[PDB]
């Protein structure tokens, strides 16, 4: 046990994340999934035909 | 022989393998042991308090084993509808199909809101746990034993209530033995019942008895997982299974 | 392929195991079922006194069940619930006399503590027109489950690995049992503390599949014999002969 | 600080009388082969004080503990007090099975037979035969379950009976001190099963 | 079904029991975890909440 | 040396009290104060916990639990080695009767 | 040289003797003494069964005799005529209780015969003002022979080689006997072509030669104590605990 004697961070709280930002933004969640790396895949017949 | 395989008389062709899900939904499930850190609803409880507790005093206990309590449905008139009628999750239904296990547990135990008091959790594992009967969570009465009170040397946390209501935990696996019994238990020998669980888990507030009284008939749920130790060793095969749905709907 | 030319001394080919001084013949091929693999010695961690394995006596093979298994018993019916470290004890005292009579357990009226894998071989002499099918399964530690009693069926010890044992075939049933108990040692006797359930290991129990079917001039019964070798062993704390007590009936 | 530099310290725990009248096989100690060997004092409080050896201190703290202890048995004689005993050890006695012992059911066990000559003092090292790895603790906190007796017990009879010359005495007293061995180890933490002396009021609960 | 009846011979037995052992083939494979549909025998006590 | 914790965002203080003596070591056993100077060396300080509630929110203090816990915070050496005192077993002692 | 300093730990250096968990020390150098040397194995010769040395059980100490000798014994006096693989068994048998009690003598329930050497350390504790002296002596085959009635005297078995045992020094005398039967293996139970005389190899005898002498107030008695060890043993003819009848009482 070294103790550390330093200063620590001095934030802000905010309840929520950004509703309006939607683009270049890292948003963090609690996924109701079992792999915190799992993302929803499409094979290749469940591709998606239109942009 | 069990799993011999005599004359495979196969009509069927190749299936292609999605990798247990990987495939489709981008994770696999093979591996049923990171299905099993999943938490799951380990107990379920209303804090009743009988005497006038002290500071030290202990609200409730329960052994701390993954082989699920002895499952409370509760009372005649008022069973705990998720123990009755969602019948034993799944971890013990993984942790029925094996013999042994030599590993750790999580705990995450959820207080109430309404409370505000400071919270100590005491892990015991000096504790025998004496048969399946009183292997469950223990509303603690009048002190007669250094069972009912905080101690000291054994390793405790204090979870804040004003700060945050749940104090999550990592029991780790010190028992003298190979491995622990994993099925129900009934006692047979003297030390095989400091086998079972991996210690005895004590849940106390430090209010007086004028604040005890907004704890009274609050709900504290304990949930667990299996914590990334956690072994289960011998293949033992499934008991008799009951179909949750053919259990009777309460009829109006 | 396929030239039968039986003589004088028969047709087949007869496989041996031989142990110290004991050579029992099965013609048949075994049904073996191994459980876990074997076990590690372990005495380095809980024993400073003298420990050896007596190998020359004790990985013999000793008889410890025999039983008629007739058509009058049922499909789901037990044969034996055999305790493996306790039967090889209870057999002897079911014989009417001690433990030190035979060579095979002698260091058990003198030691305190065994650690050891076991042989075990349900040997049938079924006849070749019966028809019907056992299964030899072992359960580690019995009596330290209590749901047991509802587990105890043929579809119950059908999932974990068995052996299964015609009728028909006169097969044989190998099964090698290595040591998994909760504690690396069994108690031979009453040790302080553990008085209750001693040198319980677990149990083999023999039920039925499918029961004897025969003529109306068949073969009515079918013999079963137990064979149980120790053989990785060892055998720690030396202690008196006089502190061992009988074992329970059961 | 550590425990086996704390457990590594004889601490004096028995004082044992051995006179001449003592026949071939008179017992001299019956002491549990655990560190929790007890020497109680014999005072007028109403909790009895107790004392221990280090290595029993420092295994109280603990939970479970294993390895082989070491008894240093000073013999406290002359060079020409001639005597011998066994110190034997026999792994896993239960109380009913205490009684009914002798130096002849001890001699099928472990056992070492002192010759008391010049040199007088010995070091048995108790062996640790367990079927468990570690051994819990013998009284724990005050909770009446979870106390496990000893996982053997250590004896010492009187092999040869003592022969004294007509000009030393006839008593020697025998002083039994207790070490935790080279391989004591205890490992885990849990409430200490004693207390000190520094304040031993104790006030009862009763609800009358 | 029975494709061609049993054929006995009149020294063995008119019946034969088959059984049936069901395994997860090479191919077998399960995904999504939701509330299991068994319960054990532990406990096999239920309560009927009737409102009466 | 102080410290205030705000209660209201965390009610727990964490503390590293240092060792300000003018010894080599202080008394580690009970201390019955035979020399006047030596009273200086048991203890490494004296702390006080207070608070700064007037005599109206001071009714809700009264009589509520405040207990504290102790380390020994990675610098503690303890020296000479003296033997145990005579201890007490704990579950020799009384039982409450009903 | 001759700088006595003794201190709390006493003065002089003690020898062990150590063996599979017996370990018992003296203070003084042995009087060996060795009647022929060390016998070979010879089962090659005579057994096609599983023979094995149980040297983890067999080789430990055992006392098999203690005994009070005091100043009224006088000179030519036998204090203990020891039949030594019987003693081993009597002394057993003397404690009231079977010989399958003891580590040391388990494989003679089992097993039907015995070939090996014997250890023999005769300790004494005498004071040293005591003054006095025995000898511990091995004659092969006592009771095959028929004027050893006369042979019985301290001057008879001065003459073979012997140890002695004075009583100023507190002496101890060790004993290596190897063994010499007129046949290499001696039965440990009632065999088809001898009944009579089992076990027998031969006699350790010991007789005083000086008788204890001291003052008015002197310490009258002494005791005296052997122990066994059964060391290059082997046993053959593994046979039921049942066919071992119990020794002669003697
Ligand atoms: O609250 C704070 C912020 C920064 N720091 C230290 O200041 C340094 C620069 O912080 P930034 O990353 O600029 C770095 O050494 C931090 O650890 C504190 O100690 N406390």
Not at chain 3, 168 to 185: D, G, R, T
Not at chain 4, 196 to 204: C, G, P, R, V, Y
């Amino acid at each position: 046990n070294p103790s550390y004697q330093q200063s620590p961070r001095h934030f802000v709280p905010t309840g929520m994340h950004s509703l309006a930002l939607g683009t270049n933004l890292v948003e963090p969640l609690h996924a109701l999934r079992l792999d915190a790396a799992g993302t929803t895949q499409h094979p290749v017949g469940c591709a998606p035909d239109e942009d | 022989e069990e799993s011999r395989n005599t004359t495979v008389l196969d009509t069927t062709t190749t299936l292609q393998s999605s990798g247990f899900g990987r495939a489709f939904f981008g994770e696999a499930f093979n591996d049923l042991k990171t299905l099993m850190r999943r938490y799951q609803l380990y107990g379920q409880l209303l804090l009743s308090v009988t005497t006038d507790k002290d500071i030290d005093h202990c609200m409730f206990t329960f052994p701390c084993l993954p082989q699920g309590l002895a499952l409370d449905i509760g009372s005649a008139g008022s069973p705990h509808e998720i123990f009755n009628r969602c019948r034993d999750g799944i971890i013990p239904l993984i942790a029925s199909g094996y013999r042994f296990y030599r590993g750790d547990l999580r705990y995450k135990i959820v207080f109430p809101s309404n409370v505000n008091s400071n919270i100590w959790v005491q892990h015991r594992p000096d504790r025998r746990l004496e048969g399946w009967s009183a292997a469950k969570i223990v509303n603690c009465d009048a002190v007669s034993t250094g069972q009912g009170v905080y101690n000291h040397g054994y390793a405790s946390h204090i979870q804040i209530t004003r700060v945050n209501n749940v104090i999550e935990l990592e029991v780790p696996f010190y028992n003298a033995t190979c491995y622990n019994y994993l099925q129900a238990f009934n006692a047979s020998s003297a030390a095989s019942s400091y086998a079972v669980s991996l210690g005895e888990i004590s849940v106390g507030f430090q209010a007086t008895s004028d604040d005890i009284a907004s704890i009274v008939n609050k709900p504290v749920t304990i949930y667990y997982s299996i914590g990334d130790g956690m072994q289960f060793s011998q293949w033992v095969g499934y008991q008799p299974m009951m179909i949750l749905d053919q259990l009777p709907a309460p009829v109006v | 392929m396929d030239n039968p030319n039986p003589g004088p001394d028969g047709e087949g080919e007869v496989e041996l195991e031989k142990d110290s001084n004991v050579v029992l013949t099965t013609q048949r091929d075994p049904s073996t079922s191994i459980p876990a693999p074997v076990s590690v010695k372990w005495s380095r961690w809980t024993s400073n006194d003298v420990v050896d394995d007596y190998a020359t006596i004790t990985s013999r093979w000793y008889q410890i069940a025999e039983f008629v298994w007739s058509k009058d018993d049922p499909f789901d019916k037990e044969l034996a619930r055999l305790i493996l470290p306790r039967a090889l004890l209870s057999s002897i005292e079911a014989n009417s006399d001690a433990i030190c009579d035979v060579p095979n357990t002698i260091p058990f009226k003198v030691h305190a503590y065994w650690r050891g894998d076991m042989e075990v071989r349900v040997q049938i002499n079924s006849n070749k027109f019966q028809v019907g099918q056992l299964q030899a399964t072992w359960y580690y530690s019995d009596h330290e489950n209590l749901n047991i009693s509802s587990k105890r069926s043929v579809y119950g010890f059908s999932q974990m690995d068995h052996a299964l044992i015609s009728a028909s075939a006169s097969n044989e049933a190998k099964l090698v049992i290595p040591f998994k108990h909760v504690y690396p040692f069994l108690p031979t006797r009453i040790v302080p503390d553990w008085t209750t359930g001693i040198l319980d290991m677990g149990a083999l129990n023999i039920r039925v599949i499918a029961p004897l079917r025969m003529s109306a001039t068949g073969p009515t019964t079918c013999n079963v014999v137990v064979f149980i070798k120790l053989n990785n062993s060892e055998f720690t704390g030396t202690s008196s002969g006089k502190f061992y007590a009988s074992q329970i009936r059961a | 600080m550590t425990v086996s530099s704390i457990a590594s310290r004889y601490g004096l725990i028995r004082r044992v009388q051995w006179k001449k009248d003592h026949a071939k096989g008179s017992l001299l100690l019956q002491l549990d082969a655990d560190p929790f060997v007890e020497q109680r004092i014999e005072g007028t409080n109403p909790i009895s004080l107790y004392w221990f050896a280090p290595v029993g201190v420092v295994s109280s703290m603990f939970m479970q503990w294993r390895g082989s202890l070491e008894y240093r048995f000073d013999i406290i004689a002359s060079q020409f007090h001639t005597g011998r005993l066994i110190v034997g050890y026999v792994p896993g006695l239960t109380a009913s099975l205490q009684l009914q012992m002798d130096y002849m059911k001890l001699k099928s066990s472990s056992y070492v037979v002192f010759d008391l000559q010049e040199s007088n003092s010995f070091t048995f090292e108790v062996p640790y035969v367990s079927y468990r790895p570690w051994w819990v603790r013998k009284y724990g906190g005050n909770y009446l379950p979870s106390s496990t007796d000893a996982p053997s017990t250590l004896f010492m009879y009187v092999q040869v009976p003592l022969i004294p010359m007509e000009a030393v005495s006839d008593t020697i007293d025998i002083n039994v001190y207790v070490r935790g061995g080279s391989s004591f180890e205890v490992c885990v933490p849990v409430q200490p099963s004693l207390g000190l002396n520094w304040n031993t009021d104790f006030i009862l609960r009763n609800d009358e």
